[PDB]
Amino acid sequence: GQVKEVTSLTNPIVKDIRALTQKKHRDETRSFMAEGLKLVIDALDLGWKIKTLVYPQVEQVAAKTVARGGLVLEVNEKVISTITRRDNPQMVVGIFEQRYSPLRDIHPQEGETYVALDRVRDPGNLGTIIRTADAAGASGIILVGETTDPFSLETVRATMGSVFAIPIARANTEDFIRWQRAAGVQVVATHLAGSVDYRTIDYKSKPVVLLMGNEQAGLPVELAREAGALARIPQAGRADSLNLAIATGIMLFEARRHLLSL
Amino acid sequence: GQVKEVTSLTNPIVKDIRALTQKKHRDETRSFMAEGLKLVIDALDLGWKIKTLVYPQVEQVAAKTVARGGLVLEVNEKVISTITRRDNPQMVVGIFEQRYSPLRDIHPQEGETYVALDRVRDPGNLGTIIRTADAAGASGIILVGETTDPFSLETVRATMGSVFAIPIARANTEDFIRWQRAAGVQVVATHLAGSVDYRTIDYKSKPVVLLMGNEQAGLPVELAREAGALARIPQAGRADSLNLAIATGIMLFEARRHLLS
Numbered sequence: 139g140q141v142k143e144v145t146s147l148t149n150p151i152v153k154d155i156r157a158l159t160q161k162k163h164r165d166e167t168r169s170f171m172a173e174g175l176k177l178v179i180d181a182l183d184l185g186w187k188i189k190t191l192v193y194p195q196v197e198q199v200a201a202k203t204v205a206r207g208g209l210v211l212e213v214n215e216k217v218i219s220t221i222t223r224r225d226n227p228q229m230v231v232g233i234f235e236q237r238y239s240p241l242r243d244i245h246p247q248e249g250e251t252y253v254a255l256d257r258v259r260d261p262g263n264l265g266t267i268i269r270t271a272d273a274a275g276a277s278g279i280i281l282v283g284e285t286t287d288p289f290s291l292e293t294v295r296a297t298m299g300s301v302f303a304i305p306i307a308r309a310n311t312e313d314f315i316r317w318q319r320a321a322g323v324q325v326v327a328t329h330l331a332g333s334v335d336y337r338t339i340d341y342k343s344k345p346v347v348l349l350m351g352n353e354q355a356g357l358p359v360e361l362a363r364e365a366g367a368l369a370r371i372p373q374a375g376r377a378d379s380l381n382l383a384i385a386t387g388i389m390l391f392e393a394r395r396h397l398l399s400l
Numbered sequence: 401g402q403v404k405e406v407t408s409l410t411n412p413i414v415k416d417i418r419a420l421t422q423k424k425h426r427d428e429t430r431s432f433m434a435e436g437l438k439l440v441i442d443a444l445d446l447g448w449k450i451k452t453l454v455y456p457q458v459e460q461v462a463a464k465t466v467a468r469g470g471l472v473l474e475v476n477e478k479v480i481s482t483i484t485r486r487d488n489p490q491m492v493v494g495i496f497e498q499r500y501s502p503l504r505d506i507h508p509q510e511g512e513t514y515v516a517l518d519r520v521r522d523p524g525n526l527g528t529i530i531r532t533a534d535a536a537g538a539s540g541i542i543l544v545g546e547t548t549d550p551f552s553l554e555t556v557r558a559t560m561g562s563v564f565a566i567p568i569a570r571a572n573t574e575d576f577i578r579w580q581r582a583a584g585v586q587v588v589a590t591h592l593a594g595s596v597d598y599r600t601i602d603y604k605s606k607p608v609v610l611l612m613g614n615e616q617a618g619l620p621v622e623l624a625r626e627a628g629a630l631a632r633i634p635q636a637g638r639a640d641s642l643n644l645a646i647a648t649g650i651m652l653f654e655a656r657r658h659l660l661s
């Protein structure tokens with residue numbers, strides 16, 4: 139591992155960091171960007187492999203990074219804001235290895251809640267859910283089907299650090315359903331056509347998987363079908379539906395009402 | 401000729417719509433933009449004054465427009481691109497008169513819930529809160545002190561039409577405190593300081609006001625100094641805060657738990 143320095147833009151490897159805003163480029167190295175000193179330090183504790191650092195506690199983190207076998211860049215405010223695309227950047231920005239938990243490795247125990255998101259489209263919605271699931275003491279996020287990337291800069295920002303603190307996993311519809319049966323869980327699907335008050339449900343007996351639907355479309359039958367309980371939050375207006383993240387928060391804290399205290 | 405067409409983007413009739421991006425123009429013209437036909441209809445059905453209407457049921461809408469003294473505009477999909485600042489946007493756009501409820505015209509009755517936001521800065525947060533508060537069946541939003549603007553296009557998008565549906569007042573800390581002290585309400589302020597568990601509060605006796613804090617600071621002591629109760633939602637982790645809108649949604653559904661089904 140090694141240190142380096144640059145101020146010009148083109149210098150191919152600085153177009154390499156820039157391009158971590160694109161999925162196709164992030165995926166070509168299983169890699170992603172996160173901003174902030176406090177944050178990179180915390181993500182290092184949670185055991186995340188750092189590939190590059192960008193920038194006095196920096197000395198020890200750079201040491202930890204170069205000694206871990208990867209690049210480190212002393213750099214001006216013009217470069218840092220251009221890669222983070224903000225006029226008013228942070229001084230320190232880490233690049234890290236993406237990691238998902240494989241779904242087969244996840245074994246729901248008593249007392250645990252999971253959030254499964256069928257085809258989540260909006261990045262902020264996802265990042266906010268990840269943050270909120272973390273806050274509720276849930277044990278992970280399961281991204282079912284084609285969703286937005288959890289490791290986009292837009293989504294990573296919205297987590298406020300929680301991307302590093304709660305397991306994320308991804309699966310096609312079939313494997314998830316296979317898993318969801320074998321796991322011995324109370325599957326709680328949510329629909330705007332659901333029959334039962336989310337408050338009237340048993341979240342105590344079994345580990346729970348909260349199944350949330352797509353923003354435009356809601357849950358497709360193939361997953362709706364599986365519900366051990368088809369729940370809905372009562373509303374009272376013109377309003378069609380709740381925002382996805384909002385709904386997920388409402389459910390997180392009902393589902394763990396008995397477990398959260400002061 | 402209220403039924404009127406334009407192709408040119410040079411036309412000053414267009415660059416004055418684009419000026420609605422600016423808050424100056426928005427505020428000094430008392431107007432704002434809203435996208436989509438089912439909005440533009442339901443806002444018409446909700447009694448809103450449409451100034452301008454750009455673009456099957458469209459004819460029935462351009463009628464209600466002109467009947468109420470509103471100008472109409474036929475323009476190409478690329479004119480609608482440049483006003484909106486959007487890829488692929490809706491066929492219709494509507495420009496309306498802004499509508500704030502004066503605070504002292506609000507009379508908190510029994511079984512009603514109001515949300516008050518101190519210094520909300522994020523357009524999305526607000527937009528969503530407005531949405532969530534419509535859905536929880538709350539009687540109105542109260543914006544306290546310097547906030548992002550609820551009639552901005554960003555915030556309007558995030559309400560998904562709920563901006564037309566729930567009244568919005570605005571006030572500085574003084575006016576708010578004045579009205580509050582008179583209006584006879586249970587002010588439940590979300591804090592972490594003097595705070596009790598949010599599921600233990602009495603939300604039945606007095607019409608409730610939920611007073612949520614600023615995304616960075618949180619509530620300023622002078623506001624929390626006049627709170628009937630201080631509520632906190634318990635959490636688990638290094639994660640110190642809930643997103644404001646998330647916190648507000650949770651509070652809303654606890655505050656109206658006894659009322660919703």
Ligand SMILES: C[S@@+](CC[C@H](N)C(=O)[O-])C[C@H]1O[C@@H](n2cnc3c(N)ncnc32)[C@H](O)[C@@H]1O
Nearest residue numbers: 328350351353354355356370371379380382385
């Ligand atoms: C924006 S919504 C979906 C809207 C839905 N397709 C419709 O228009 O009929 C996104 C998701 O949030 C959740 N959601 C929203 N409102 C809800 C409610 N009252 N009860 C349960 N879930 C809700 C559901 O999981 C839903 O699939």
Ligand SMILES: C[S@@+](CC[C@H](N)C(=O)[O-])C[C@H]1O[C@@H](n2cnc3c(N)ncnc32)[C@H](O)[C@@H]1O
Nearest residue numbers: 590612613614615618619632633641642644647
């Ligand atoms: C993101 S917070 C900022 C709080 C601030 N960081 C602090 O140190 O208090 C925005 C506001 O949302 C509300 N909020 C967020 N999490 C909350 C919780 N767990 N309980 C009650 N209110 C909360 C509060 O009104 C808070 O002032």
Ligand SMILES: [Co+2]
Nearest residue numbers: 154157163166
């Ligand atoms: Co590349």
Ligand SMILES: [Co+2]
Nearest residue numbers: 330354355356
């Ligand atoms: Co639907």
Ligand SMILES: [Co+2]
Nearest residue numbers: 419424425428
């Ligand atoms: Co002007």
Ligand SMILES: [Co+2]
Nearest residue numbers: 616617618640
């Ligand atoms: Co704080």
